[PDB]
Amino acid sequence: DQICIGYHSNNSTEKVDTILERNVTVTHAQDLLEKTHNGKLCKLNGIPPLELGDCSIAGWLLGNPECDRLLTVPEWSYIMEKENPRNGLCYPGSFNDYEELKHLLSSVTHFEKVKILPKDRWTQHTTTGGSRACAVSGNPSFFRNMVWLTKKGSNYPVAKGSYNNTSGEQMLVIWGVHHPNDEAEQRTLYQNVGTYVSVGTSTVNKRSIPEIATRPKVNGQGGRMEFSWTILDMLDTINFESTGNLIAPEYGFKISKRGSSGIMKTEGTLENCETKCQTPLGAINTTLPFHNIHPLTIGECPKYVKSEKLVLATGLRNVPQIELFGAIAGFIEGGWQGMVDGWYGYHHSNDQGSGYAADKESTQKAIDGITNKVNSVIEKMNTQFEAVGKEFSNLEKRLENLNKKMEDGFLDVWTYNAELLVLMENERTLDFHDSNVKNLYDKVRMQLRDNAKELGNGCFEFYHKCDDECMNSVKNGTYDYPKYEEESKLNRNE
Amino acid sequence: DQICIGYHSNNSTEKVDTILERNVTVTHAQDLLEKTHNGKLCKLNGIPPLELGDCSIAGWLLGNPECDRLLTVPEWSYIMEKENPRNGLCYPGSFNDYEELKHLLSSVTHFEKVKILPKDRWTQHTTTGGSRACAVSGNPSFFRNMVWLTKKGSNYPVAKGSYNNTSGEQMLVIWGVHHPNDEAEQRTLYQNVGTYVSVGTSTVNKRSIPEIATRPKVNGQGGRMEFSWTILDMLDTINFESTGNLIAPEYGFKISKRGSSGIMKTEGTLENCETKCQTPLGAINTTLPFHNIHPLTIGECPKYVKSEKLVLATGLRNVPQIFGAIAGFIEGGWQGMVDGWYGYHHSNDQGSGYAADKESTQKAIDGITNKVNSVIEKMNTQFEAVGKEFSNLEKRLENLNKKMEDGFLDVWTYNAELLVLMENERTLDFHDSNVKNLYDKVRMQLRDNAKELGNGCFEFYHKCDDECMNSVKNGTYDYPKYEEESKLNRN
Amino acid sequence: DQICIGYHSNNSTEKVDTILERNVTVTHAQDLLEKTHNGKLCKLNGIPPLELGDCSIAGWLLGNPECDRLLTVPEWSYIMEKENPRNGLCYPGSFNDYEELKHLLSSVTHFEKVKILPKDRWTQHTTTGGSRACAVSGNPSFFRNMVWLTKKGSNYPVAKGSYNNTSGEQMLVIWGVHHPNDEAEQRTLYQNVGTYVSVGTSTVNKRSIPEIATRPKVNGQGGRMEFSWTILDMLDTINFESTGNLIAPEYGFKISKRGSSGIMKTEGTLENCETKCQTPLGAINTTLPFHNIHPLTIGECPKYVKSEKLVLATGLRNVPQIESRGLFGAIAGFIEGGWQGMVDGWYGYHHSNDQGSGYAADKESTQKAIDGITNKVNSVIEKMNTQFEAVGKEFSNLEKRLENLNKKMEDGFLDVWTYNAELLVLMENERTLDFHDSNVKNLYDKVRMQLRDNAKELGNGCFEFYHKCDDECMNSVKNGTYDYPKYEEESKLNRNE
Ligand SMILES: *[C@@H]1O[C@H](CO)[C@@H](O[C@@H]2O[C@H](CO)[C@@H](O)[C@H](O)[C@H]2NC(C)=O)[C@H](O)[C@H]1NC(C)=O
Ligand SMILES: *[C@@H]1O[C@H](CO)[C@@H](O[C@@H]2O[C@H](CO)[C@@H](O)[C@H](O)[C@H]2NC(C)=O)[C@H](O)[C@H]1NC(C)=O
Ligand SMILES: *[C@@H]1O[C@H](CO)[C@@H](O[C@@H]2O[C@H](CO)[C@@H](O)[C@H](O)[C@H]2NC(C)=O)[C@H](O)[C@H]1NC(C)=O
Ligand SMILES: *[C@@H]1O[C@H](CO)[C@@H](O)[C@H](O)[C@H]1NC(C)=O
Ligand SMILES: *[C@@H]1O[C@H](CO)[C@@H](O)[C@H](O)[C@H]1NC(C)=O
Ligand SMILES: *[C@@H]1O[C@H](CO)[C@@H](O)[C@H](O)[C@H]1NC(C)=O
Ligand SMILES: *[C@@H]1O[C@H](CO)[C@@H](O)[C@H](O)[C@H]1NC(C)=O
Ligand SMILES: *[C@@H]1O[C@H](CO)[C@@H](O)[C@H](O)[C@H]1NC(C)=O
Ligand SMILES: *[C@@H]1O[C@H](CO)[C@@H](O)[C@H](O)[C@H]1NC(C)=O
Ligand SMILES: *[C@@H]1O[C@H](CO)[C@@H](O)[C@H](O)[C@H]1NC(C)=O
């Protein structure tokens, strides 16, 4: 008659990591890292994104003739842009505060083009100007959303234009100034010398003087156009005045939707899916709390860590019994492969029956503790750092370096935190299982007191031939020492 | 004869958290977080702050007629500014490098107004300009610290003015340029076209051309005024030259005190109390090492963590035991003991007792005190937040600042919570291990002359008195003396 | 008739820190912090640095007469500069985007000077202008790399100049504009009022108008010179045009090597060494993974932490057996201290038979403990290689907010990593000491379980057998193949007595 104490064993092959030891096989393990994507760009919560193709943001907003499919655009969830777009400013020039405009657009979802200064209103100027830089079917053309004002006949009168915003939302207005390359061009276009362009709102006051200089030919042109933008508030008016060199707007952009969006730098095309998280390399469909695909992300999906494997050890160490009679063994030499009922067991051999009964109170406590540990580990890492895309100009290298260093540092800190937490928790889990088995064995030894012959394999042979009910009493904790101690003493005295 | 090993219990209802367990009752605990404030603004170390009221920094430094109570200002600890002040620039315009000026002012404690260009020196111009934008009792007026220069008759001679910084410290100077709305206003105000304003020092060199354009009316005016500033070093000179459109200064602001200060964005008011540090919501009065009121504080007071609870366990589990034959540590704690933590219940032929141990308890107390001190000390070099202001065209910089501060606060909060949880686990395991070690020590000393009852203590196989049990407690138990006695009774 | 279980103690004196106790003596420990330097500025991989001396970057690039030894410079590994150099802009003025130029130079290793606008192409102007602000031997002079254009007679024709970049690499070009102090100076120098300076490239378009004003005298002059720069791409053209106030370049700087370098603020002089990384205070020669000298380093060498000590406990606890029973006295075990006669391993099996004694060492436990501790040290060192490295940056007088942001970011990351390292060391020390204690207890418990009841424990660390044993039985107990069913009768018979 003997009750033996041991633990569970199975045929799992999962391997976890520990600070003191690597390459450790366990019974059950939980994976927290997702490393798979479908590699396709597609729709976020039913709203397709805005595909710019070979066009840039400036080329879309100004109305490049090549970007003629973006004249009217529906609601979008994010914007696809290429690293080096081909169709930008067809006429060579610059764009003031381009990165600030992109940052503002990174949180706008829909637009609404409003005709604020119709082309027919300029009855004292010529509005059919064009250039060969932006040519359609050989003939010269121009930006579709802007008007090029030139002299009519031989005089260029003072040009005035105003607009009072009553559209119900904030508005985006873009204008420009032309810089010719010689006085002959200036006289043949505007007939005046010493011109100015003045723009004035309630908070904006600018005066621009054109600069005439010789420059290298870009797109076959020596001149340049400089573009500026502003945000017009509700019930606020904008005023234009110029004696020449004014590229007046015709359309204003009204902010309609607003929301959470972004500009994603990719070179792919939109496919047919339905996803919830989108990365530049692909989409993610998972319920795991971590991922290692790309730091930049639009939507809702797990956090980012630079790790290759994050596995949490939930079960016990997998060391079997190493492959005739009386081999009931114990937890000293290994686990039991034939329990499959619980975690810590009470294998027994009574004079009439034998079995592999499993404990219930200790297993429940261990499971509750492990589940609490897993939940705490997950809940400690939902306040991580999220990266937001930003763009910088050629003369903003210090700021770009600062941003990159900040992002990299925070990412490294959080990765280190996650790895250290997983390793330490694995160590404590294995120690916890060993301690629980030892505590069970010690409690049974204390209860059995003297009427037991401890064998050293992990279990003890009784000094009395006590039946089942005695043994369920031992397992339950209600073993009565003086009930049957006289017979045990008599048997031991032999 | 029985000697039982156990642990102390009481009636406390303090709960701590752990990685494996939640809401565990402990005998003793320490709170590390303050969550209360008086909801008031008052003096920092006896120096009252500077209450702007319905005014802004630009309106105070330029001399807005509504801010006439700030013409002379004493020493201050911090500046109270509303989010959207009403009295700023009376005449519409703009201020160049405003945020840099605020950043500079955040480390200045006292000013001193010095008359650097008296109004009467401009004997070839008119210095009685005004506007209805800032009018007092109907009649037009102007900024009190600046001079508007206008025709004298029908001519505007070239205006020249210089100042040499012999005051004693650095000085702040402000000047302005006027942009009219039409040529008629320019001709009736200055009688010149194509004017300029030139300012030059040993470092700065500027020349501004006025702009004339049609603009929407703000405060009833279509014109604008553009203001600039510079810091004049000691024994340096500043020169003014203009043929028109010049708003010249009359006073300069000398940096007198310097120190550590800040600007608070609050809508409250100053009342009569005293504090050691101040937050925008109220004052803090504590000796605790953490708080969760507001990240931006001025003074000397604890670190900020975005947490609702931070409790450290400095005691044992509260599991009280529930006739005769007093049990031990297997069944639970003892309420009788009041002296120490680890128990050595005393029972004998003539008297019993509830004696404590003075060796293990001292070691445990020293270890726990060292742990608490290490936890508090390892966190005295954590991040602190400093206020900053950004313009409408610096949203990327503002986002970078906000993200950096938020990330550092999150990192430190995570560190705090993880440390507290791990230390609580370690403390509970430490106390259990200490009790087990005491029991094992007693069992090792008592080889065979005792029998294990199994519930936490032994019954001796031999008769003894207080001497034997005191020897057991002191680790001087000797086997050979009472050996034959026990071997006889073992039969 | 006695085997005993114990551990190892020696003559060491190293001390470690623990989260529960301070200044604990351990047998072996490993240091991870380097706190020494030679206090010298030396070569980096055989390439000497660029010694500016009393000159600034602007003075070197523009060609100050005092910096005449830097006209031709070889390859460099880093740049040594002073906090407040004396010889900068000889003629007073400014330098637009100075800090951006310094940031660009922080990744350039060699320069090669190309003559792009020879001084003799200006056949309609005067190219011998000079000033007394920077004069050699009393006679007036000017920047050696730039040309000051003035009148030839009583006229100033329009000046034009172009260059096509066929040098094979990106190029740095610097020009300037002169602001006089009165109209008399302007007429004496140019005979033109309303002049302009226009510079135009593929992506650059600028136009400057000189400003005339009265300013205080700096180095005896009331005028200022404003300098601008640009980077010229390959196969691109730069155009110049001015009616006056043009300070044209003669040489252009061609980027040749490129690499990882920086600008170091020091007041020292170069000496003869060969180091692998350099700090502003000195050079470092170490194999440790940490140092606490200076946050700004150039080269390859360990990470930086604000700590005074970082010692890892790789050994046991030094608690020697203070009591020493002279001659007579049984040898105790592990409860009352460690042993000194042990010289082989950490956990031992001292035995005392009738034909001799011994101090043997268990090899199964010692090797496992060594493997575990080595893995622990390797993991600790590995986890801290993804630290934060600081980079020097310069800011102007109107960028205080950005400077504060940079300083706070660097400092905060520094404190975070220092805290991480210190906490890891403390916790690992605690776990190591408890690990050794648990290993000794496990050895004792294992032998007790194997040996069952054929002995009597004395509680001092070991037990005396109830039967006669020899070297074979000692070896069987130590190895783990003790045979109970062959001694039970004799053991019981002896114990009954
Ligand atoms: C721009 O349009 C708004 C709306 O029509 C104008 O605001 C109105 O101004 C008149 C003044 O004659 C008031 O009587 C109305 O009550 C105003 N309406 C609202 C809704 O406030 C505004 O004046 C126009 N801007 C300009 C420069 O004329
Ligand atoms: C501003 O004032 C200071 C001191 O009043 C002037 O410095 C003095 O200059 C004279 C030149 O004639 C010297 O003789 C003195 O020794 C200087 N004194 C000191 C204390 O340095 C300074 O020159 C004045 N600024 C200007 C532009 O003249
Ligand atoms: C600068 O020099 C390059 C190379 O010498 C010029 O590029 C050549 O342009 C001509 C056009 O007339 C082509 O026929 C050649 O094939 C080009 N050569 C190369 C190597 O690309 C370039 O045109 C010059 N810049 C200017 C403004 O003329
Ligand atoms: C297990 O073997 C070695 C242990 O040192 C380890 O390097 C290796 O990576 C492990 N095996 C796998 C498949 O990772
Ligand atoms: C995401 O994966 C789940 C698997 O649980 C699947 O049922 C679901 O259809 C997937 N979603 C998409 C959009 O493919
Ligand atoms: C204590 O915390 C547990 C979470 O495990 C919660 O279920 C319980 O309600 C809490 N007790 C009280 C009194 O709030
Ligand atoms: C701060 O609290 C203490 C209580 O410890 C009290 O004595 C003191 O008066 C308080 N300070 C003020 C300003 O009320
Ligand atoms: C301790 O003993 C060792 C013996 O190997 C010796 O080398 C060392 O110098 C001694 N230390 C002191 C401080 O005497
Ligand atoms: C070692 O640390 C303890 C801290 O408990 C301190 O009291 C002692 O002075 C220290 N010893 C030395 C030599 O620094
Ligand atoms: C660096 O130190 C080692 C000793 O650890 C020495 O052998 C080597 O010569 C030193 N290097 C130099 C450059 O002095």
Coordinates of C-alpha atoms in Angstrom, one line a residue, chain A residues 74-430:
Chain A
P74 CA -14.5 60.5 -52.0
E75 CA -13.9 59.7 -48.3
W76 CA -10.7 57.9 -47.5
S77 CA -9.0 56.1 -44.5
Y78 CA -5.3 56.8 -45.4
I79 CA -3.2 58.1 -48.2
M80 CA -0.7 56.1 -50.3
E81 CA 2.3 58.0 -51.6
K82 CA 5.5 57.0 -53.2
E83 CA 9.0 57.9 -52.0
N84 CA 9.9 59.8 -55.2
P85 CA 6.7 60.7 -57.0
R86 CA 7.1 61.6 -60.7
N87 CA 4.2 64.1 -61.2
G88 CA 4.6 67.0 -58.7
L89 CA 5.1 70.6 -59.7
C90 CA 5.1 70.5 -63.5
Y91 CA 6.3 74.1 -63.6
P92 CA 9.5 74.3 -61.5
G93 CA 9.2 76.0 -58.2
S94 CA 8.8 75.5 -54.4
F95 CA 6.1 75.1 -51.8
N96 CA 6.3 76.9 -48.5
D97 CA 5.6 74.9 -45.3
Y98 CA 5.0 71.7 -47.2
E99 CA 5.7 69.5 -44.2
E100 CA 3.3 71.5 -42.0
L101 CA 0.6 71.0 -44.6
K102 CA 1.3 67.3 -44.7
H103 CA 1.1 67.1 -40.9
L104 CA -2.2 68.9 -41.0
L105 CA -3.5 66.6 -43.7
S106 CA -2.5 63.6 -41.6
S107 CA -5.7 64.1 -39.7
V108 CA -8.2 65.0 -42.4
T109 CA -10.5 62.4 -43.9
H110 CA -12.7 64.2 -46.5
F111 CA -12.5 67.4 -48.6
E112 CA -15.0 69.5 -50.5
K113 CA -13.9 71.7 -53.4
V114 CA -15.6 75.1 -53.4
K115 CA -15.5 77.5 -56.3
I116 CA -14.6 80.8 -54.5
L117 CA -13.1 83.0 -57.3
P118 CA -14.6 82.0 -60.6
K119 CA -12.4 82.3 -63.7
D120 CA -14.9 84.5 -65.5
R121 CA -14.7 87.3 -62.9
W122 CA -11.4 88.5 -64.3
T123 CA -12.8 90.7 -67.1
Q124 CA -9.8 93.0 -67.4
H125 CA -7.1 90.3 -67.7
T126 CA -6.2 87.3 -69.8
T127 CA -6.8 83.9 -68.1
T128 CA -5.8 81.4 -70.8
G129 CA -2.1 81.4 -70.1
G130 CA -0.2 78.1 -70.2
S131 CA 3.3 76.5 -70.5
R132 CA 4.9 73.6 -72.2
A133 CA 6.0 72.2 -68.8
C134 CA 2.4 71.0 -68.2
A135 CA 1.4 70.0 -71.7
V136 CA -1.6 67.8 -72.7
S137 CA -1.6 66.3 -76.2
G138 CA 1.2 68.6 -77.2
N139 CA -0.7 71.8 -76.5
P140 CA 0.4 73.9 -73.5
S141 CA -1.7 73.8 -70.3
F142 CA -1.6 74.7 -66.6
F143 CA -2.7 73.6 -63.2
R144 CA -6.4 72.9 -63.2
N145 CA -7.2 74.5 -59.8
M146 CA -5.3 77.8 -60.4
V147 CA -5.6 80.7 -62.8
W148 CA -2.6 82.4 -64.4
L149 CA -3.3 86.2 -64.9
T150 CA -1.5 87.9 -67.8
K151 CA -1.9 91.2 -69.5
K152 CA -4.8 91.9 -71.8
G153 CA -3.9 94.0 -74.8
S154 CA -1.1 96.2 -73.5
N155 CA -2.1 97.1 -69.9
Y156 CA -2.3 95.1 -66.7
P157 CA -4.7 96.8 -64.3
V158 CA -4.7 96.3 -60.5
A159 CA -6.2 92.9 -59.7
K160 CA -8.5 92.6 -56.6
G161 CA -10.4 89.7 -55.3
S162 CA -12.0 88.8 -52.0
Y163 CA -13.9 85.9 -50.5
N164 CA -15.9 85.6 -47.2
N165 CA -16.0 82.1 -45.8
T166 CA -19.6 81.0 -45.2
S167 CA -19.2 77.3 -46.1
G168 CA -19.6 76.1 -42.5
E169 CA -16.1 74.8 -41.8
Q170 CA -12.4 75.8 -42.0
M171 CA -10.9 76.2 -45.5
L172 CA -7.6 75.7 -47.2
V173 CA -6.5 78.3 -49.8
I174 CA -3.4 78.2 -52.0
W175 CA -1.9 80.9 -54.1
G176 CA 1.4 81.5 -55.9
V177 CA 3.9 84.0 -57.2
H178 CA 5.9 83.8 -60.4
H179 CA 9.6 84.6 -60.7
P180 CA 10.7 85.1 -64.3
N181 CA 14.2 84.8 -65.7
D182 CA 14.6 88.1 -67.6
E183 CA 13.0 91.5 -68.0
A184 CA 11.8 90.5 -71.5
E185 CA 9.6 87.8 -70.1
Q186 CA 8.3 90.2 -67.4
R187 CA 7.4 92.9 -70.0
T188 CA 5.9 90.3 -72.4
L189 CA 3.7 88.8 -69.6
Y190 CA 2.8 91.7 -67.3
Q191 CA 4.0 94.8 -69.1
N192 CA 4.9 96.3 -65.7
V193 CA 8.2 96.4 -63.7
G194 CA 8.3 96.6 -60.0
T195 CA 5.2 94.6 -59.2
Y196 CA 4.0 93.1 -55.9
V197 CA 1.6 90.5 -54.6
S198 CA -0.3 91.2 -51.4
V199 CA -2.4 88.7 -49.4
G200 CA -4.2 89.7 -46.3
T201 CA -6.5 88.0 -43.8
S202 CA -7.4 88.6 -40.1
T203 CA -4.2 86.8 -39.0
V204 CA -2.1 86.7 -42.2
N205 CA -0.3 89.6 -43.8
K206 CA 2.2 89.0 -46.6
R207 CA 3.8 91.0 -49.4
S208 CA 5.9 89.3 -52.0
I209 CA 8.3 90.9 -54.5
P210 CA 9.2 88.9 -57.6
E211 CA 12.8 88.0 -58.2
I212 CA 14.2 88.1 -61.8
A213 CA 17.4 86.1 -62.2
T214 CA 19.1 83.5 -64.5
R215 CA 18.7 79.9 -63.3
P216 CA 19.4 76.5 -64.7
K217 CA 16.6 75.1 -66.9
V218 CA 14.3 72.6 -65.1
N219 CA 11.7 71.0 -67.3
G220 CA 13.0 73.3 -70.0
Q221 CA 12.0 76.4 -68.0
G222 CA 14.2 79.1 -66.3
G223 CA 11.4 80.6 -64.2
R224 CA 10.1 79.4 -60.9
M225 CA 6.7 79.6 -59.0
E226 CA 6.5 79.9 -55.3
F227 CA 3.3 78.7 -53.6
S228 CA 1.9 79.6 -50.2
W229 CA -1.1 78.3 -48.2
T230 CA -3.2 79.3 -45.2
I231 CA -6.3 78.0 -43.3
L232 CA -9.3 80.3 -43.5
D233 CA -11.5 80.5 -40.4
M234 CA -15.3 80.6 -40.4
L235 CA -16.8 84.1 -41.2
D236 CA -13.3 85.4 -42.1
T237 CA -12.4 87.0 -45.4
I238 CA -9.3 86.8 -47.6
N239 CA -8.1 89.7 -49.8
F240 CA -5.9 89.6 -52.9
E241 CA -4.2 92.6 -54.6
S242 CA -1.4 92.5 -57.1
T243 CA 0.0 94.5 -60.0
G244 CA 1.5 91.4 -61.6
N245 CA 3.0 88.0 -61.1
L246 CA -0.1 86.6 -59.3
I247 CA -1.2 83.0 -59.7
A248 CA -4.7 83.3 -58.3
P249 CA -6.7 80.3 -57.0
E250 CA -10.1 79.2 -58.3
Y251 CA -11.0 76.5 -55.9
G252 CA -10.9 76.3 -52.1
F253 CA -10.7 73.1 -50.0
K254 CA -13.2 72.7 -47.1
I255 CA -12.6 70.3 -44.3
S256 CA -15.6 68.0 -44.1
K257 CA -14.9 64.9 -42.0
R258 CA -11.8 64.9 -39.8
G259 CA -10.5 61.9 -38.0
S260 CA -7.6 59.5 -37.5
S261 CA -5.6 58.9 -40.7
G262 CA -2.1 59.1 -42.0
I263 CA 0.2 59.2 -45.0
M264 CA 1.8 55.8 -45.8
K265 CA 4.9 55.6 -48.0
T266 CA 4.5 52.6 -50.2
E267 CA 5.0 51.5 -53.9
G268 CA 2.1 49.0 -54.1
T269 CA -1.5 49.1 -55.4
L270 CA -4.8 48.7 -53.6
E271 CA -6.2 45.2 -53.5
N272 CA -9.5 43.7 -52.3
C273 CA -9.6 42.8 -48.6
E274 CA -11.2 44.0 -45.4
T275 CA -8.7 44.6 -42.6
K276 CA -8.5 46.4 -39.3
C277 CA -4.7 47.1 -39.1
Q278 CA -2.6 48.2 -42.0
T279 CA 1.2 48.4 -42.2
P280 CA 3.3 49.5 -45.2
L281 CA 4.4 45.9 -45.8
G282 CA 0.9 44.3 -45.3
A283 CA -2.2 43.9 -43.2
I284 CA -2.5 42.2 -39.8
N285 CA -5.3 39.8 -38.6
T286 CA -4.5 38.6 -35.1
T287 CA -5.6 38.7 -31.5
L288 CA -2.1 38.5 -30.0
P289 CA -0.8 41.5 -27.9
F290 CA 2.5 42.0 -29.8
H291 CA 3.8 42.2 -33.3
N292 CA 7.1 42.8 -35.1
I293 CA 6.2 43.8 -38.6
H294 CA 6.6 47.6 -38.9
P295 CA 6.7 50.5 -36.4
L296 CA 4.3 52.5 -38.5
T297 CA 0.7 51.4 -38.3
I298 CA -2.8 52.8 -39.1
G299 CA -5.8 51.4 -37.3
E300 CA -6.1 49.3 -34.1
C301 CA -3.7 46.3 -33.7
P302 CA -1.0 45.2 -31.2
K303 CA 2.2 47.0 -30.1
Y304 CA 5.6 46.8 -31.8
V305 CA 8.7 45.2 -30.4
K306 CA 12.0 44.2 -32.0
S307 CA 12.0 40.6 -30.9
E308 CA 12.0 37.2 -32.7
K309 CA 10.3 35.1 -30.0
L310 CA 8.2 36.0 -26.9
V311 CA 6.9 32.8 -25.4
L312 CA 5.5 32.5 -21.8
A313 CA 5.9 29.2 -20.0
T314 CA 2.6 28.2 -18.5
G315 CA 3.0 24.5 -17.8
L316 CA 5.6 22.3 -16.2
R317 CA 9.0 21.0 -17.3
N318 CA 8.8 18.1 -19.7
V319 CA 11.1 15.3 -18.4
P320 CA 9.6 11.9 -18.8
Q321 CA 10.2 8.8 -16.6
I322 CA 12.9 7.5 -19.0
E323 CA 11.0 4.4 -20.3
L324 CA 9.3 -4.4 -15.0
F325 CA 7.2 -4.7 -11.9
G326 CA 6.7 -2.2 -9.1
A327 CA 7.7 0.8 -11.3
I328 CA 5.1 3.2 -9.9
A329 CA 8.0 5.6 -9.2
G330 CA 7.5 9.2 -8.1
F331 CA 8.4 12.8 -8.8
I332 CA 12.0 12.4 -7.7
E333 CA 13.0 10.7 -11.1
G334 CA 10.4 12.3 -13.4
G335 CA 6.9 13.0 -14.3
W336 CA 4.0 10.7 -15.1
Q337 CA 2.8 10.2 -18.7
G338 CA -0.5 8.5 -17.8
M339 CA -2.3 11.1 -15.7
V340 CA -3.9 13.3 -18.3
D341 CA -6.3 14.4 -15.6
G342 CA -4.6 17.3 -13.9
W343 CA -1.2 18.8 -13.0
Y344 CA -0.2 17.3 -9.6
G345 CA -1.3 13.7 -8.9
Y346 CA -1.7 11.1 -6.2
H347 CA -0.9 7.8 -7.9
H348 CA -1.8 4.9 -5.5
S349 CA -1.8 1.2 -5.2
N350 CA -4.3 -0.3 -2.7
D351 CA -4.6 -4.0 -1.9
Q352 CA -7.6 -4.2 -4.2
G353 CA -7.3 -1.3 -6.6
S354 CA -4.8 1.1 -8.2
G355 CA -5.1 4.3 -10.3
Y356 CA -3.8 7.7 -11.2
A357 CA -6.1 10.1 -9.2
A358 CA -5.2 13.8 -9.6
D359 CA -5.4 16.5 -7.0
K360 CA -7.9 19.3 -7.4
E361 CA -7.3 22.0 -4.8
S362 CA -3.6 22.6 -5.6
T363 CA -4.1 22.5 -9.4
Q364 CA -6.9 25.2 -9.2
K365 CA -4.7 27.5 -7.1
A366 CA -1.8 27.1 -9.5
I367 CA -4.0 27.7 -12.6
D368 CA -5.5 30.8 -11.0
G369 CA -2.0 32.1 -10.2
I370 CA -0.7 31.5 -13.7
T371 CA -3.8 33.1 -15.3
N372 CA -3.4 36.1 -13.1
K373 CA 0.3 36.3 -14.0
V374 CA -0.5 36.2 -17.7
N375 CA -3.2 38.8 -17.4
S376 CA -0.9 41.1 -15.4
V377 CA 1.9 40.7 -17.9
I378 CA -0.5 41.6 -20.8
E379 CA -2.1 44.5 -18.8
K380 CA 1.3 46.0 -18.0
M381 CA 2.0 46.7 -21.7
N382 CA -1.0 48.5 -23.1
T383 CA 0.5 51.9 -22.3
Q384 CA 3.4 51.5 -24.7
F385 CA 4.8 54.1 -27.2
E386 CA 3.3 54.5 -30.6
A387 CA 5.2 56.0 -33.5
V388 CA 3.7 58.8 -35.7
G389 CA 5.0 59.5 -39.2
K390 CA 6.5 63.0 -39.9
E391 CA 8.2 64.7 -42.8
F392 CA 11.1 67.1 -42.7
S393 CA 12.8 69.4 -45.2
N394 CA 16.4 69.4 -46.5
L395 CA 17.4 72.1 -43.9
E396 CA 15.8 70.3 -40.9
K397 CA 18.3 67.5 -40.3
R398 CA 18.7 68.2 -36.6
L399 CA 15.0 67.9 -35.9
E400 CA 14.7 64.7 -38.1
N401 CA 17.7 63.2 -36.2
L402 CA 16.1 64.1 -32.9
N403 CA 12.8 62.5 -33.9
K404 CA 14.4 59.3 -35.1
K405 CA 16.6 59.0 -32.0
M406 CA 13.5 59.5 -29.7
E407 CA 11.5 56.8 -31.6
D408 CA 14.3 54.3 -31.6
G409 CA 15.1 54.9 -27.9
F410 CA 11.6 54.4 -26.8
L411 CA 11.2 51.3 -28.9
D412 CA 14.4 49.8 -27.5
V413 CA 13.3 50.5 -23.9
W414 CA 10.0 48.8 -24.4
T415 CA 11.5 45.8 -26.1
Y416 CA 14.0 45.4 -23.3
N417 CA 11.2 45.6 -20.7
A418 CA 9.1 42.9 -22.5
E419 CA 12.0 40.5 -22.9
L420 CA 13.2 40.8 -19.2
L421 CA 9.6 40.4 -17.9
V422 CA 9.1 37.2 -20.0
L423 CA 12.4 35.7 -18.8
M424 CA 11.9 36.4 -15.1
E425 CA 8.3 35.2 -15.2
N426 CA 9.4 31.9 -16.8
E427 CA 12.0 31.4 -14.1
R428 CA 9.5 32.1 -11.3
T429 CA 6.9 29.8 -13.0
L430 CA 9.2 26.8 -13.1

